[PDB]
A paper describes a structure:
ClpXP and related AAA+ proteases maintain cellular health by degrading incomplete, damaged, or unneeded proteins in a process that must be specific to avoid destruction of essential intracellular proteins. Escherichia coli ClpXP, for example, degrades proteins bearing a C-terminal degron called the ssrA tag that is added during tmRNA-rescue of stalled ribosomes. Subsequent mechanical reactions requiring ATP hydrolysis unfold adjacent regions of native protein structure and then translocate the denatured polypeptide through the channel and into the degradation chamber of the double-ring ClpP14 peptidase for proteolysis.
The ssrA degron bound in the top of the ClpX channel in a structure we call the recognition complex and moved ~25 Å or six residues deeper into the channel in a structure we call the intermediate complex. The ssrA degron bound high in the axial channel of the recognition complex, where it was contacted by the RKH, pore-1, and pore-2 loops of ClpX. Importantly, access to the lower channel in this recognition complex was blocked by a previously unvisualized conformation of the pore-2 loop of ClpX subunit A. Thr199 and Val202 side chains from the blocking pore-2 loop in the recognition complex made van der Waals and hydrophobic interactions with the Cβ methyl of the C-terminal alanine of the ssrA degron, and the side chain –OH of the same Thr199 side chain as well as the peptide –NH of Val154 in the pore-1 loop of chain B made hydrogen bonds with the α-coo– of the ssrA degron. For example, all previous structures have open channels, whereas the axial channel of the AAA+ ring of ClpX in the recognition complex is closed by the pore-2 loop of subunit A, which makes specific contacts with the C-terminal residue of the ssrA tag. Moreover, only the pore-1 loops of the top two subunits in the ClpX spiral contact the substrate degron in the recognition complex, as opposed to contacts between five pore-1 loops and substrates in other known structures. Subunits ABCDE of ClpX contained ATP/ATPγS and subunit F contained ADP in the recognition complex, whereas subunit A was nucleotide free and the remaining subunits were ATP/ATPγS bound in the intermediate complex. Thus, it is plausible that ATP hydrolysis in subunit A of the recognition complex drives an unfolding power stroke and conversion to the intermediate complex.
Residue numbers in the entry:
A (entry chain M): 2 to 198
B (entry chain N): 2 to 192
C (entry chain F): 93 to 191, 204 to 314
D (entry chain E): 62 to 275, 282 to 414
E (entry chain D): 148 to 203
F (entry chain D): 370 to 414
G (entry chain A): 259 to 314
Amino acid sequence: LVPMVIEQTSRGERSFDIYSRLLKERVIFLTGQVEDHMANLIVAQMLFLEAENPEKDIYLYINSPGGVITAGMSIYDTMQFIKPDVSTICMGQAASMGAFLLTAGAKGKRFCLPNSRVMIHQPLGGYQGQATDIEIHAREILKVKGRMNELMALHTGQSLEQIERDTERDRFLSAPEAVEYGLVDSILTHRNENLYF
Amino acid sequence: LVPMVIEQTSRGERSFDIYSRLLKERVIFLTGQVEDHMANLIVAQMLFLEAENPEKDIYLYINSPGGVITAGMSIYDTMQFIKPDVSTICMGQAASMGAFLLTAGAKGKRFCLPNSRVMIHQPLGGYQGQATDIEIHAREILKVKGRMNELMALHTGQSLEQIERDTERDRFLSAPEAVEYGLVDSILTHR
Amino acid sequence: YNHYKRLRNGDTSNGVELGKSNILLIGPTGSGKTLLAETLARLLDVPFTMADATTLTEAGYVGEDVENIIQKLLQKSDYDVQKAQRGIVYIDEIDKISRGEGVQQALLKLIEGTVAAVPPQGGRKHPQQEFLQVDTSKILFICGGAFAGLDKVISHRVETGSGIGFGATVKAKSDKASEGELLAQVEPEDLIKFGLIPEFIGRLPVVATL
Amino acid sequence: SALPTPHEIRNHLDDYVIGQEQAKKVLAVAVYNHYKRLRNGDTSNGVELGKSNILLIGPTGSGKTLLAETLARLLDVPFTMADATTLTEAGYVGEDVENIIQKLLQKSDYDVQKAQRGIVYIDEIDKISRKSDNPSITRDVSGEGVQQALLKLIEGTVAAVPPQGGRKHPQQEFLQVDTSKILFICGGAFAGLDKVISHRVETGSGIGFGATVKSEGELLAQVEPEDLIKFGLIPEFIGRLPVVATLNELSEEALIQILKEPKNALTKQYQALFNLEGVDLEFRDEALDAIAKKAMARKTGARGLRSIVEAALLDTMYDLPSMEDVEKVVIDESVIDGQSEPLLIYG
Amino acid sequence: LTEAGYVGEDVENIIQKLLQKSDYDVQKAQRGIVYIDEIDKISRKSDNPSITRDVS
Amino acid sequence: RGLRSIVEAALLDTMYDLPSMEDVEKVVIDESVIDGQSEPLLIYG
Amino acid sequence: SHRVETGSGIGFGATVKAKSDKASEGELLAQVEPEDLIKFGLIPEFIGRLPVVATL
Ligand SMILES: Nc1ncnc2c1ncn2[C@@H]1O[C@H](COP(=O)(O)OP(=O)(O)OP(O)(O)=S)[C@@H](O)[C@H]1O
Ligand SMILES: Nc1ncnc2c1ncn2[C@@H]1O[C@H](COP(=O)(O)OP(=O)(O)O)[C@@H](O)[C@H]1O
Ligand SMILES: [Mg+2]
């Protein structure tokens, strides 16, 4: 159950949902596993916000343990496509896809909370069938891993070799560790002493 | 089912849900296990209330047996991030995550009912796989446990060593006990 | 004192026109609103009339209804335009009309100041020109009424935006001491939420709270 | 008997109005042309001059009603001020559109020939606009029903006016008044029009990938008729009102000027009150800035100013008449806040 | 105009204006011309049942 | 009726300052005046 | 009736009121106040001139 809120407009009072009311303020939430449906929803919201105001920055809060990759690439491509700077924020955690989307935000507009924890690891997959099909699917996931590592290095500014060594196994990072690694630009400890917005 | 409630405004009678009516009065509820979706909802409510009037205090009612830690930390970080003082109240019970959020409220604005029951314990986890990943995940939960204890000690004002000794196993506390532990500022016995 | 001091010096030779300031009386029922206006009229030998906004809420031919007020004053004034222009008008239940925007619009035109045509000494039929022309700009208008909901509005603004939670201060024993101090803090913003029109509030700068 | 030029008229308006240059130019030009069209009543030539009606648009407390009042001071011809909220469709008990001319006659001492040459200001015209239309199959009395009635009045037609404070009826005691030469100035604080203008200016194409992505006074200065049609005005009504004048909102600096620069400024009014009482009143510059912030914070505009001053000097005005040997009163910024009392100089 | 009994006006008024132009010479008015403007303002709102009578 | 609005706007400024002006015998309105790029050309004689 | 009647409740403890308890004009005109007369159509000042109210 989502609480409904009232907004006092010029015409009169209007009822809105809590998630829709925040959207009106250019705020999107990426919670739960990344799938095609939720990703499609986020894509629709980004496009709607861009058309509404293409200058103002879009805030995206991320609290998810990761999920499908393809769905994440759609969200990532949409962010790099639109003109607005998509300010990504990390709440709770950000796994591989969450972290890739977190670092994919606009330069200088990526934030993390003091007690957040980012996690990065290589893609996961599998296939069952003949050896020929197995080799095909293997090459594809490998190409995906290469593409994902290249993008992570581009946003973080680190060397591809360093990323490959750190993505071979589950690597956890706190807010300070992320800042020095290039995943995030700054930390948001409070609202009335940073005023980054 | 959620009963509707009529609010008498200047001219237009407005129908509200029982939970939305309270939200209009800066009152949030944290019931059931702490997951990512419910936590996201609580965060949205906090942000919405902050935008409307950032100088008015917010109230968060807590009746939950706990849950995931990442979700609880997101709620905690949001409370410490916004300007409004988040007054936490404990109704029924407050487990590890509930208690961490309870004690995390604004100083002097943390309350608990007389018959409430608080519970604190170390984090829980597990992993299945190779030894390398196991060692990595073990350090992470250990770092979280240390970080949680620091925050618990910072809000309660107790010694980190004492908190660690009390969190090695399930520790139950009544409303009076919590008051002397620094978890809760005062008890609301009557009006 | 100020309103009549201006009438004492109508010319006031200078490049300055003295604008009228009307009064808004807020308070509960039977608290002495009408008595204050009546007592002033006894002290100052001027005609005093009383009107009720609720009767005027119909919003049909408001010009005639508002003009009638002036006609009532003339009868008490003995059909003296000079004496009538110095009169005191008290309007009651001004809160009820709020939500009747058209009623407020008609009223503020009368409060701001306008020329009204009143038939002289009754009569079966009389020509248009014969009608007496009185100006309401020089007449002091007092608007009263009890604003019960307004108290809660002030608390929602001045105090914490609460009233339903545990911490919420709802220790209400009908003392009314809290309500009196809260109404003292009344500002135009509070009246706007109650349903009044900003134009009307601006013509009632003086706010007295019983 | 040379007529006053627009420069003279604008100078007179500046004495009482601050911050509306375009509206002042339009009104001055309209009034000047009005006098010229009336002077050549005979107009011996193959030409009949046609009036151009005005349309004022501006937020509340901008100076619309005030501009109308200022004209009345410097207008030889009869000027009347009317409100459109009362007006209703003929056959309904609310009000009729002929009452306007009735008020105009009162200002002219019931001299028809002197009223036809008059000016009429109609306030709250936006209220008539169909904002939340919700089609009116039953009826539309307060809105579209009033616009339809005004059309001929503005355009010019003989109007049956009751003698005084009467309604239309079979009675034949009606005198005909012609509004062909009467000038109309319809002023309304259109709310939400800026959103309509922004939509047209920032319509864009769509929302997807393939789609293309694109001040109140400055925004309102781009107003076109189509913007008003969508707001609820019939195309016919705008045609009757060719001219359009926009009024920008009052800034904090403007409020400070309003306190002292005008001829009937708030500060000057109180100084006169004290001066006739034998006391001198001085307002410090800091106080005026403080008052403006209070009004701006309360969103009360220029109207609020009278309340701020009345409250500040309430205690002083109460004890001043009884007070003796008091020659000057000084107001400081603290006095407006209420922390301190105004300083008094004893002589 | 109105529906013969309401406050607005009567239709016969038109003829009155006509007589004024002819100096109340009936025989000179009966052969006159009349122009009724804004005739679209008097029309049912695309409603055949006519729930309520439209006096205007 | 739209024409009256256009002509009024183009000549609004000129009408305001024409009486103050002296020695002006002719006013010329070009196509640019309607667009707003240029101002009416005044002839002094 | 509207002024002095708040209706009835719905629970067990609530006092249900039947038609016989309608409290008609008999015994209901004594509670009358000047505000009720004004709604009926009288003038406020007119009532003040008549303080005595004899009810039958
Ligand atoms: N430009 C101005 N110069 C001087 N005083 C002003 C100005 N604008 C507003 N005021 C003051 O504000 C008061 C109210 O302004 P008005 O113009 O009467 O309001 P408005 O323009 O009629 O808006 P409406 O009619 O309420 S929609 C005036 O009596 C002045 O004292
Ligand atoms: N302070 C007072 N002193 C003396 N009489 C009072 C006072 N307040 C109210 N009254 C009495 O109440 C009546 C007027 O009440 P009023 O204030 O007009 O009610 P309302 O404000 O609802 O119109 C008078 O008959 C008067 O005797
Ligand atoms: Mg106006």
